[PDB]
Nucleic acid binder design. Structure first.
Length: 70
DNA sequence: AGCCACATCCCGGCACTCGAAGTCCCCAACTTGGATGATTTCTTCCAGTCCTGGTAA
């Protein structure tokens, strides 16, 4: 089903490393993809963690995004 | 060696004591024997309603 897979391929455009909408769903615009900052000895942060991505956009997609973003 | 600034130092001076009875010492502080049985601990029915999405067809 090229249509089902096409709808799934489209979700890739909004995979991100950092989520600009987290505290408030009203924020509108582009995604953010950045490598973790250099480690600071006195601070707990993403600097000590491996690279991972997530997904946010329409409520409807949830299932269709799972093929490539898992 | 002679001259000047700044430290303190000791005598004359000053002010206070201050109303107005005493109130007992010393050493000791208990051993033993037992704390109960038999029975039972509730049942009927019920457990609100409405407002407060973003995104794309």
């Amino acid at each position: 089903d090229e249509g089902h897979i096409t709808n799934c391929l489209h979700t890739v455009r909004w995979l991100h490393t950092h989520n600009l909408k987290y505290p408030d769903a009203r924020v509108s615009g582009e995604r953010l993809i950045i490598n973790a900052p250099p480690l600071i000895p006195g601070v707990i942060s993403s600097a000590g963690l491996p690279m991972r991505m997530g997904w946010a956009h329409d409520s409807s997609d949830i299932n269709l995004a799972k093929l490539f973003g898992t």
